[model samples]
Target: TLPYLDPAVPVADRVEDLLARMTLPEKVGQMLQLDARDGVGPAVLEKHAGSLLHTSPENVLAAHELTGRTRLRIPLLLAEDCIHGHSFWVGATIFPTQLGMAATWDPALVEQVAHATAVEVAATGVHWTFSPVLCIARDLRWGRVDETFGEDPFLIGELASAMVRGYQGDGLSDPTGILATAKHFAGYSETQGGRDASEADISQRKLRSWFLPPFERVAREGCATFMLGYQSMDGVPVTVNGWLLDDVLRGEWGYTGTLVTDWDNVGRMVWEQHIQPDYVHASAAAVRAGNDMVMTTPRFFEGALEAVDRGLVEEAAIDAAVRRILTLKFRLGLFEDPRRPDVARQQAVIASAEHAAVNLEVARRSLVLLTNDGTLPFAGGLDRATPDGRALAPAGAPARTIAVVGPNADDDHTQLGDWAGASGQADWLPDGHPREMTTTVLDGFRALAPEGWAVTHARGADILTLAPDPEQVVVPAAPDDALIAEAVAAARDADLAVAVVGDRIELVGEGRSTATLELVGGQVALLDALVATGTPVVVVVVASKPLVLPPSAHAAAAVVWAANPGMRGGQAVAELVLGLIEPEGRLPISFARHAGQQPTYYNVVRGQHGVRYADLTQSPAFAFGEGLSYTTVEYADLRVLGTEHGPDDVVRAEVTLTNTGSRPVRETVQVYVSDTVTSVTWAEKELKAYRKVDLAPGESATVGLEVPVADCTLVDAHGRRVVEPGEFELRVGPSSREDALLRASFTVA
Candidate 1:
């Protein structure tokens, strides 16, 4: 047997042996990562592609069988856009979107969810997941906000690191673990007017300050791969930007992992960006920029070979990229065992009860109580467990009828959100996952209602009607007065009403960024009609991102933000409304009152001339770290242990938290640091550390906090991250709102 094929051979030795044996065509094919949707025939047998994405179960088998027919016999690296859970897999346990998970502010839970997703993904023969999106959600109008962790770099870093650890789990040798990719590496979300893939005007220094931190943290933590973004930063597309791919990522961070381009990144340079004249130039630039895997660029095979022949790029660069790819496959032990899909394993693990439990827990934690006015937990106090541990309302509770109304009230597809089944990326799932797998808000209310209470539902409004676009695709139809009157009649008859309103799949995802953040179609009208009725209305925003709330919604009795809660999301929403569970989630991103108030993120530089726009206040309707619980929590007695500290020392502090209300609460104690002086203009305050304190009714406890001085850093004008030694204020609070926080002073000496 050949040394490369021998299981006992060292991974380095195997990679070298394979490298020396591969012909020019074979090596170029090894770098090409083609789409599996068009079938594996030409991409595999003819082109000899090394990686396949969007592969269905049948296609995975086909690709593997065809890989055996290749001259070199190098195993294919199968990848999928498993953003949240094994999204494309039928009947898989779908969890909350990344934004929803971020609301939990629990990295441990996020880690568990990612680990479970990897288990399900691996069982289906997928070798890698292009997930755990580290992009900051600063632009609410961006269609892909649901995929991000949120606005803050520190928070994004914390959650992303956990997800990376989870997806990699004990490294590549772990059978259940798949390769984790820290994606859209750098500034993809800094869109112009929130248009997806628009030119990003971010400078290198600005990137270092904000976007690069999270990417850097994940890279240093050893995430297996990094995917380039579609956008051009400062006039250069990320695919061919050597300053970012080589100088920063590889040179500074020392990232040795494989780098893959986003879909058609190479070809886009020739056609879309118009930077390169042909595929030869684009292919040469991409390889020299250190892109190891060329995703979805079918012509890359010929382009790369031609570039090598024309002396546009040296063959040595192609060898370097192929070496990295082979090294990863060797580490995964794919040569010895290709990790094919086991039918029995798929049956046992995919959508398993264990994973469902984690999904439910995350769903429950993801429900952020944006605003409440004693109308929530609805009449019935709280549910109690029976002798068999089944949750049921009290026997003596008063009977009440609830009217569940609006477009998203019973939407199974939107609940799953983008990158999941039927979200338009994959073609296999036309109708999406099994209907029985998802519990709609209507379903949840009916399933969890009190014994004598009544649950009613109305298709209050239609979010969109399809119309043909100029490009032959579909676009959303204008808002109409469809079923608003029926919704109002239902609200008038019921004791309470829940108007679930948000954008659908059509208005979300890549290339689908919105110009306005308003509730689309008849949703605003439906909400307005419901509020006109004197009946207490609970407005639930089951949306992909934080949308601008209309006047009627603000006038409602209560409001909740559920960012595309997954399969069990409706059940979790019902539990929170019916007092089966408390609202524990905090806002990962802020809500805007108006679309014109574009950038509502908390950590802005202190140099803005004025705080208000001509017609609107610049402040967000709801701030980051803002979420309400069933009970009230008070922050007091914030004390810094030392008035002075060194750069190397940990800044120790403590704060008192008192639960003032009757119900139990889990409070997120957010800690922020404001530097009194700086070499350059900086954010007024930055989140440094945080802790969660759980307290029962009328319970008081002291929560300790620790933040290393090194952690309190900023990228200076010269692009160096360092902590400025000066007077600083330690702000501790429940949210980012200034009035909500209590402050104590300290100095870094």
Candidate 2:
């Protein structure tokens, strides 16, 4: 039998046999991941790159074909930023952003979304999805907040774990399974000033207390891959942080999966962060630091080869890295069949009817009702006056007129957010998604409007326009006028106006952090004009991250946040605004009122000398875990079964929730724990567990949460992890604020 190619052979033996047959060039090539957009021609000519990223299925297949011309018949591994479904691929199912999904608080639903994403991705010949961004979004200005599961570490871990299992379903051996990447390693999200890829000023204690646990959870849970971040933690670049990559991840967590770097992470060490002098030094250090795959650095090919030749990088290290790569390939059964592209599978699975059904359901669940002053579930039979003091259709009318304004209302690409097909990130999506396949807020309202409803659209103002800077980087568009007079006219004629607003793609994504979180350009002006018309307005903040609202948003009859909801997002928002579907989603991140209140996670360290900021109140515009349903729900009869428990003992908390209103409601019961006194400073209250329950009108249900006493771990002043034996307060409520909570005490033995 051909030892490396034989299916019956042990994976370890196959990996070692393949490693022994490789030359220095082939060994180095196995460690590099190149970009396929520029053509894998250079990759094959160098005959060293083992993987290609951001390429089409056709390009991937063609690259594999070209690789056969090389000395080794190595199959190329294709990877992409499939953060939310096959994002860059046209005609693929796209779900709501991670923040939106977190609002749903349903991990089972999220797992289904990931499974669907994997099937579509695998059918297209891509093996790895660089997804499940396990970053704690402490600050709202960070552009990628939409890509995460929100601010709480435990919540992020729960949802991310679900996605990991969904992607790696059954196991890697399953054909539908794809490699799930737990990315940015430790503390990649705690960037200085919320700047993307900036220095992470996190101590080892802080890292362990908050950031590292999620990665550790997925690692132990057998996530197939770990992707390093572009930032440095504690002044050490993550790509070369051996203490984290080796000691923590592999040694303590027992993760045997392959480790890959973010795009150009190694090259940046030399040119960007100045951690290493050149490519040779950076490549050598990164490989020695335990990175198994170097991504998108042309220099890695020559630099790694040079390092081995110059004795800077040990040949054994190269062999070890190559072995891990080969082990994954063999286990994936790539050596036997390579899972080549099948047009039939792609046709059947990519954006199929089944996928769209899932997408719409998730999108519907992801809609968070921030505020509603009786403007929602718009009962169509009522008559209303327009902004111009004009009377609407007479009373008992079946439909009402809606004025859908703002850039996001009709723009299909903005609703999809970053990394979407035609997000302008790659040439393939330049024209954006096909119009027939996408639905915007305007489209949703138009399609699902009540009988005889008239949905009129007006471009209220330019959300943002792209302009090139001296570096040729596309800069964010200034608040240019959007024919405001025209939008006001539309509002004047409509019975009630539905204004959609938020940040554009230019102000979101990597390196796109904003200093100010308020609505940009003419959004406030547009809102002002609409409100002045004397029309009751519903404002939907369809943004990637939480933005500080302008006065008009607060004054509007109703307010909502879409958070870049996916493909069927527009329809979901419309249905929600029309009150066709009940609101169930909650705020996953605190919506700060100003940028100064940075790091405003609800579960932050207690005892700030003063509660309020000098300029604006420290309190957020909206609290974390805060959202309203159409029906009124009440919490009563809080019960804690036990007050104290041993380290390994399980503690359960139960609460009675009643749907008091006439309509049924879905509510997320949140339980937060605060150590009455601790060895060191800790969050005022940390989210320990949450359960989503559906309660019928006038029905009461007892919801329970089982928590491990040992899981309530904290890092002490001496940087030691322990569950302190002390008095603690358990706060149960709907949101994370003191006013919304009912408390009880407990102790740990």
Candidate 3:
């Protein structure tokens, strides 16, 4: 009945009465959130841990029974990284990587995806999702950038809030929704060269100003859980630093959110970051820092007990912590009904055809169009082709042929991106699916083709490599070159030539970041050969991050940019390439012109030249907001309502977009701010707000985008996000390349 149970309740009162009746071990039992798995049985819950966060559903039942076996009848509070579709299970719906989803620039879509994800996760009987990895990924080199929504604070804020709203679904008590976890507390994404859990050279000013905004935003939106990052933000590990987890996250801001530790990292500050002397003390600092729960081997609980014995942590503090966890559990309706009887129903929803269909839509909406030379909406291809080996004759039809060239074309493994994909491996099968049936790009094309629709496929050139030895680069004395020539000749005569290119399987992630951002090894050579065909070549760059292709894309008939689309990616791609699906995706991060374009996050402010390498222009071959569509989008009739305010006044802006093309398409209209003055230097440009709108062919719609007047503000030298009392230029456009002036001189009060 009370908002939260007080630790100082009289012995005659409920919790004190309960604590008086319980043993010290039982008190400790109320303090932990553990992982329930095979081998470790009834005793884990009965003897220790207040809840289980990572137990499989079968094991969840086991845990409940084990809890029932406990003398106190404690229920399990389960959590999962149900981030992007309950990533813990096999055969679960693998939604677009967060980065891909962010590319849509659609908070509404992200909310929808998260809502669907929550439904699926809850269906599996999961109560909490450690999701919305909120740290803005600064360097693309971070292997886990795939887990982040790219690098933009404003965009991350909108996406984060949407995900939390989606997960919690308006109320924490929603039976079909799960609690949301905002994670990696702060600046983990800015790790030096993007190394995981590495120290970030961030000042409190930068962390609080830039990296911390999204966590704050999501918290304001009612995100209930926060996961502390392993990295140190201001020379102090976030897990142990109250300055971040408490002072910044909860104290200074009004984030009444539930906070938890990242896996194995809560107790690690002592060893990994060397901030604390031991796990016992490290966890003491975590609780002191306000981390309310732990997801690993009861290190927090074990440490808390040690703290209490040492008189370093008051028993009252421990009780306060238990009350916090209990409050969240109660809020999730876990106490009233700790178990779900319809886990099969939940699984049915998550793994349902509908869920998979959403993945397809996301995959399609998330695909960005990089270039087009009038070669798409591929109308001349086989429209009357049959599934078998026959086709009805079209009197006016030209010979229909498709030249599928590139190693990735037939590779199901690469199309699924990094980490485990559906069906590529038994061990890595997605969350809820029985086994992965990874659809390769070739398979996708085949499924879309008609009978007798012959697709000549050849490995035009070697894409992957074994070693650096010139001899190791073994080939059949230009077997690749020969193949290239063959494919080109075929392309010249075919109706359409789809040259799939971009990153190879092992080229990005963990060992993936290269000093070179260009296409790797013989893969570029193969792409070159495809380009030289002089046919209408549609080059599809399938990669995690955008790589620099030559001006060749400008010359290609059409250019398709598809990141490893995951399990159902091939089907998504097939629809795009065959003109069955229109291009709707946008770039989540800025793609620089070349490698020398060092640190090109799209939200960069005005001209400080942070990591710009002059040798190569800092421009992306395709810009950050870049994405093409078969349908042309016209950004016309733009207006700004009120702007001449101080740094505290909210500004309203609007832009009218019309789909001038014949098909309906999803378009992201981005609003960017460049200031002549700032407390500190900013990037060349900063994205302030964005809107994703769906347009019917020939349909026009007016989009209203609003943010705090702070949207036009910059985090100045003094560490305040301030809206300068100066002229703010608001540029509205489909992509950064095609800029249109919706309005300008927007002032923040």
Candidate 4:
């Protein structure tokens, strides 16, 4: 038997043994990561493709069986866009989106979610998950904001690192572990005018400052693979940017993992960006720039062969990429064990009760209570608390009528968000995950409402209805007057109305960047009518990203942001409303007051001429890290232990937190660091550390804090990250707002 086929041989030796015997076609095919949606026959038996993505469980077995027929008998590396949970897999646990996970501010919880996702994914014959999107969510209008872990680089790094560790548990040999990808590598989020995949006007220094930190952190921390971004940064497509792929990623950071391109990135260089003349040029550039796998580019097989034949690209370059692919396969023990889907494992792992509990917990923590008055906790409101300070339903409370209305109130797909069943990514799930698995907002309220409570439901608005245009292309439907009337009637008959609103699948995802982040269709009308009915409206925005709220919503009793909170999200929302669970999530990304406030991220570089616009205030509708609990917590007596500290020492401090309200609370104590001066312009303040404290009514805790001085560095003019000796202020608060924080000065000498 060949050494590559021998389980006893070293992985490096096996890779070399396999690479030495591969022909030109075999080598090229090894790099072609074809789409398995159509069939595995052409990609596997014909092209001898080494990998396949977007594959169904049936196709996965077919592809593995087909791989045995190849001359070298190489195994197929199965991959999927298991972005949040095993998204496309039927009956898999679907947790909240990445932005929703970021709201928890608990990396350990995120790790658990990723680990559970990996368990389900590995059991389904998938070896890699294109997840833990490291791109900073600065521009909310970008359709993919739901996929990101929010705006700050540090937070993104913390969560991405944990996700990678969870996914790649116990390294490559871990039976339950799958390959984790730090995706959209670099500045895919820095789009022009908040459009997806547009030209990103970012400089090298700028990339180093905010965009590349998370990627670099994951890269050094051993994320198994990296996926390139679609946009061109500084006039160079990320697929073929030598400075990014080679000098920085491989040269400076010394990353040794495999590199995979985004969907049709090689093909897009020619057709979409028009940077390359043809597939030959595109293939050559991509190969030379260190892309190991060409995702969804079938033409790359012939183009790569032609590139070698025409001397456009060196054959040695192809060999190097093939070697990397072989190395990964060997490390995964693909030659010995292809890791096919095990039905027994699948039955035990996929959407198990244990996994669903994790999903429910994440959903509960992901709900951000953005605004609230005394009208919350529908038991009797916050004013009616028990002697123990719990917001429980009062004895002999009246049976109230609660109206659940809006386009998204009963929408199962919207709750799951993009990249899941019926989100247009996979074709197999026509009806999506078993409808029974997902509890919609209406389902939650109906199931969890107090005994004898009447939960009336009505679809107050249609988000979008497809109608043929003059050219016969589908377009958005006009606001329906009849639907608005129905919703208004429901609200009028009810004591309180919970209007759920947000973007639909048609309005979000790739190539679908929305221009105006407003509630579309008849949603605004429905909300307006509900408020006018004099029914206390509790607006729930179950959106991918924050939408500009109407005045009616602002005037409502409360506002909640559920960023695609997954299968159990509806129950979580109901629990918060009924005082069954406390709101534990904070805003990962800020809510813009208006779409005109495009760049409303909290960490904007200082030096703006004025704070407010001529027509509107520049402040975000809800700042990052802003979320409310049933109880109010106050911060005071923030003091740095020492007046000065060495550059290498830890900045130790403590702040006294007191629960002022009658109810119990979980307070997220956010600590931000502001540099007094810098060599270059920088953000006024950056989040450095935070602590979550659980307090009973009137409880006080002096929480200790520590931050490494090295973590306070910023990218300099020459692109080096350094912490300058200077005066710094430790600002402790509930959120990123300056006025809400208690500040104490210190010196780093």
Candidate 5:
């Protein structure tokens, strides 16, 4: 019996033993991933394929059956685009988009979401989730911005790290655990014109300063895998950037995780990036550059073997790649029966009541109150004590009509956004998910409306008219006058109007970048009509990424933004409107007034004297970390607990936070640092630490946080990260807004 087959041997030892016995073709087969949609036949599974993508449990088990006929009996690793949830899964719980989760600023809640998602994924025999996108989303125009955890590197790292912990659970051996991947590694978001997979013209200095920190943090935090991005770093494609994949990630970080390339990234090196002559060269380049697995490039089976025979790629390189793959499979106990799907586990875990509770909580907390003019917490236009102890419409106040209008108001496909069943990002779901399983804004408002309130719905205007071919750009179309007139009549008759409007489903996900961030269609016109009717309008922007709202929404009685909140999002938004839950979420990403002011992060470097645009103010409509609460909270008494510290020592600050209003409020106490003077240019301020706390009405808490001096290390002119001993100002505040911040000084000697 081979030692590799012995269960008692260590994973490393088993991987080495297996590598010694494997032939070149077998090893090459282990490196290639085939797309399941192309009809993964027996020949590919038995002879050349090591992995499958965009799969279901049935197809995965079928693929496993084919692999059973092979000599090695190596279980194929099942992979999918599980960005938000087991995205393609039929009945898995879909939490809010990544940006929405980031808005909650509750890492623990995010961890729970990932844990539930992993359970559903594992039950289907899938071994890996290409999740926690890890891109900083510097440009909102990038359709993939919805997939990221927002702009701040520290926040993205913080939330993404928590998600990794949740996904990986106790270890690879845990039944519910799946491998977590930190993706589009290193500067994928620095695209020209915010184009998807376009050239990222960033210098090494800029990469370290802004783009690389989140990936660095996740790698150091023990993320299980790394996925290469679609873009080229400088002149070199990331699939072949040895300096990045090897020198930085593998060498500097000492990351032992398996590195997987994004979909067809190796093939793209030749066809898209044009860096390689053919598949053979591309295959050799990817292996040499440290990509352990080539995703969805079927040509790699022959090309890689050709590379090895031609001496373009060393046999040892193939051995190293296969070894890494096998090591993960062994650790995950995938070599055994655990790799197969259990129908029982699938039935019990997928979309359970317990999971739905957590999803609702995340959806509730992820709601950001963008604007309010004494029209929120509804009170249903008439206030009185209710049986549930909530203020509601009195019996005498004739049932107020609440007209719910807009495309997204009733469309589950739009609310679910991209990467899910009908998002059109993937062609798996042609008919879309069942309507019974999804909760739309219309459903939510009707279900949660007060006893005396009548929730009427009308399709005011279409956001984007879809083409016969789903691949076409969804251009906004004007509504007919008859439809506009009907909506106006509805608004005029209603006491309150809830208009849900935003980018349609086609406006999100990869390769869906848009030039403008405004309301898709006659939605602004519809809103204006409602406003002219003198009705108190409550606008809900159910979008994937932040969209620039017109003056109508901003001037409306109340404005709310929901980042494609999942299944129960409609209910959560309804509850939020009816005062059932507090508006606790903050803005994860900033809303730009225009798409031109991209890279509009708040912690910008301090070299530019004129940061403002001549035509438009450089400031965003809503700053990062901005959100409104029903009850106001204040920050004061910013005391530097530690006066001075060395480079290795930690900097500590304590602030007194008070809930000024007579109601409980949750506020994220943010700590930012500004180098009054430095060896070179530095960000205006960097987010060092933060804590989100809930305080009782008129209650105060003395909260303190410690910032590791090491976390403040900055990249200098020579591309070296170093912390200079100098005087620095520590700014503490509720949001990233300048006026909201309170300043205090500290020194590092």
Candidate 6:
């Protein structure tokens, strides 16, 4: 936070003396932020721009000249959609995506990553970065699942809070700390069909229960600002829906922060959806809806004047908007102490060995080894699973013949996931767009493998619908038969088959949802066909979302779920493959058994399945919190710390995890509790908590996991999260509903 931004000073009190000082255009100019990536249409800036936004080294200086600030005394807020790394820049260090960040289960790393991002972003002198997508990604089939952290409410909140802290810092007042904008406010992720901006039909209780937590936490935690989503919630487009922006976010949450419309989302209600007949009518709704500014290439004068004419939008509202914007600028010390970040400092920090080292560490832990047979921890060994793992990658490593197969294998841009603007990680984003830099897993792994590993590649059809310009684009179709044959031949002869598969394509927002969370269409044909040959396949899942896999497929030699590993994704995979990193990530959400169980969850209320679905089974491809480690991990000595339970008391459960093997490894000790014959129906089993701990050979930790029977409550028709009084049985090991019931007891409170 800046050391000097004062909330006490009123905008009118400070600038009212110059009340008649500006013309209408100048007033209008104050609200616009221009995208200056391509050559600035200088004429547009000189005539209508309040701010100019070119980042090229050559144009950096001249960008100032193009800013019409001198003509209107309005400085421009150069904006870029910096979702991952400093998006749109070259040679930037990209870290794992948001989902990967959550996998680490470390909030501090999140803060650290954000700190690095702020330092790099501020250096470019661009003030606003649109990032930290706070949507609660629920369905796996949604293409944009990679953009979100994952399905757990607690995890999403923790990571989001840290990101805001990382981006805006302790306050908006700091020069190094950039302003953070929370996007697509409230329940936009529950869209029907996971289709972007389709229909979002949900009960009010679901909104408060499933979607509102993140935004509430953001506001309560003092997030800088927020952006409205394009989707409608409760029969209203969030952009122009006053109840959300006016009654809830601003009024209820008391968010005094700046509210922005999604790109041209302000005009959607009128021009596209026809909620209003004209731009002027849409403008009136938007003002009433409580958005402070319109983010668009063209101006929204019709709406601005419509509100002014109706006398509904006051100058105070406009001034209120300007004040909010100015407060951040002033907090950034942009007005009093304006100085571009030192260049040498930037170059030095861009690929700072320390930062990269941290990212590598993240890459290590974030990798979830889904199903690794004893084949892992290859001849080299896994003592190198941490920062020490670098030792596994040799000044000269062995050259083993490798077969790199699958649709996601070479898609570097897809590996980084979404909002990649945060680290400028991948470069698949078309030129002129905010996102540009990124790396593919094929590239990252090739660099790490030994010299002679003949890595053959094949396209087994497209992950998405088949279409032209398929790079990073998912085209719908079955894997090519000819390519599958080539891949089979490659795998048949190779020492080991590293088949990379999973999600790729589209940042489809609300449109990314899906009914079947499994490998779509004929990709399964490739998987089924390849495995038929009985080749030892190391199925590496590099996609964003978890899919429902066939049970037999689960017994593969090994499975590594690398969360879209970004540009250095290959290097990350290489390290994991060579046993350089002890895979530690645990599942945050339940993996379903079949498509018919589409929205069925491990924590669902009892009697959740529809009366009868002839073909659907109630189970997941794999239970959540499931991952394998190379070395053996045995669990023994389970004891409930406290036997007694009160209505509100929490019971602590302890388990000793021992790495009873020659090599060190990681294991997740999960805790679950079931309410037997409660006042209300409950799931067969429910997850209380989980801990992912690492131990050296013969090392053990008495993990004290606390379980609160209070969590057995239900948010009934009345919308209350309450525990039903009865005997609650406690289970342990892994997953929510199906984990081994290590201990059983009925809690009578």
RMSD per candidate (Å) reads 1.5, 3.6, 5.0, 2.4, 2.3, 5.0
Best by lDDT: 1
Error (Å) of candidate 1 at residue 436 is 0.4
lDDT of 2 by residue, 26-141 (tens): 88889888888887788866756799888876787788788778777888788888888888777788788888888888899999999999999989888899989999898777
Q: Each prediction's Cα lDDT score?
A: 0.89, 0.84, 0.68, 0.89, 0.83, 0.64
lDDT of 2: 0.84
Model 3: weakest 10-residue lDDT segment is 423-432
The parts of candidate 1 lying over 4 Å away from their true place are 385-397, 470-482
Question: Residue 725 of candidate 4: its Cα lDDT?
Answer: 94
Show the lowest summed lDDT stretch of 10 residues, model 4: 382-391
Candidates 1 and 5, the one with greater lDDT:
1
Note the residue pairs that clash in candidate 5. none
- Model 2 weakest 10-residue run by lDDT: 381-390
Which residue runs does candidate 6 get wrong by more than 4 Å? 1-12, 15-20, 33-63, 297-299, 310-312, 338-342, 379-400, 421-481, 506-525, 548-552, 609-612, 634-651, 670-690, 706-732, 741-749
Query: TM-scores, in order shown?
Result: 0.98, 0.96, 0.86, 0.97, 0.96, 0.84
Choose 3 or 6, whichever is better by lDDT: 3
Candidate 2 similarity to native, TM-score: 0.96
**Candidate 3 stretches greater than 4 Å from native:** 1-20, 42-47, 297-303, 341-344, 379-398, 411-413, 418-439, 456-497, 501-522, 533-536, 548-556, 607-614, 633-643, 646-666, 692-710, 738-743
lDDT of 1 by residue, 87-193 (tens): 88888988999999999999999999999999999999998999879999988889899999999999999999999988989887789989999999879998798
The sequence of per-residue lDDT tens digits that candidate 6 reaches over residues 473-566 is: 4456666678778777877777666777776545233345655666654567667666766766777777667777755467667777886765
Error of 5 at 52 (Å): 1.0
**Please, what are the lDDT tens digits per residue for candidate 3 over residues 416-481?**
565444322123343425434556667777667655466677666656655556633322223366
Q: lDDT of model 3 at residue 606?
A: 54
Residue-pair clashes per candidate: 0, 5, 28, 0, 0, 59
| Candidate closest to the true structure, highest TM-score | 1
